């Protein structure tokens, strides 16, 4: 471990699902296809979100690899790859990552830093009428 930071516990990583979080200065979502630990911790966000709403779609085999059909967008990303099915309009950036012990860790080389956005957080309804 050199330059690779831990991202989240392999085990908090629900099986079929992945999550974005905040790693140093790039989101990364980290798809978790089974009970394993060979993980898919890639910066796969849509900017409509913020989240990784393209890494809770439809984790699947499309033809001999893991692919995952975005909900939205529909395109196919291969998790390892970052390609779109077939044209690359949409193609997302996928980082290398290492299993130490139980955590999951990627090799964080910065490409693209933007700054936090100011959105306002999310509003109770308070009841109306009893």
Same mark, same amino acid.
């Not at 998790?79 to 390609?83: A, I, N, P």
């Not at 996928?94 to 130490?100: C, G, R, S, W």
């Given at each position: 471990m050199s330059q690779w930071t831990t991202v989240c516990k392999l085990d908090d990583i629900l099986p079929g699902t992945? #999550?974005? $979080? &905040? #790693?140093?200065?790039?989101? !990364? $979502? #980290? =798809?978790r296809p089974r009970n394993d630990e060979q993980v898919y911790a890639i910066?796969? !966000? /849509? *900017? =409509?979100?913020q989240a990784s709403v393209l890494s809770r779609g439809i984790v699947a085999e499309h033809q001999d690899d893991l692919w995952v059909a975005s909900p939205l967008k529909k395109q196919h990303f291969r &998790?390892? /790859?970052? =390609?779109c099915l077939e044209d690359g309009a949409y193609s997302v950036a996928?980082? /290398?990552?290492?299993?130490?012990n139980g955590n999951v860790q !990627?090799? !964080? $080389?910065?490409?693209? #830093?933007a700054v936090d956005n100011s959105q306002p957080? *999310? &509003?109770?309804h308070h009841h109306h009428h009893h």
């Open positions: 992945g #999550v974005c $979080a &905040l #790693v140093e200065q790039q989101q !990364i $979502a #980290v =798809f910066s796969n !966000i /849509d *900017p =409509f979100a &998790l390892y /790859d970052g =390609f996928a980082y /290398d990552t290492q299993v130490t !990627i090799s !964080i $080389a910065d490409s693209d #830093v957080l *999310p &509003l109770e």
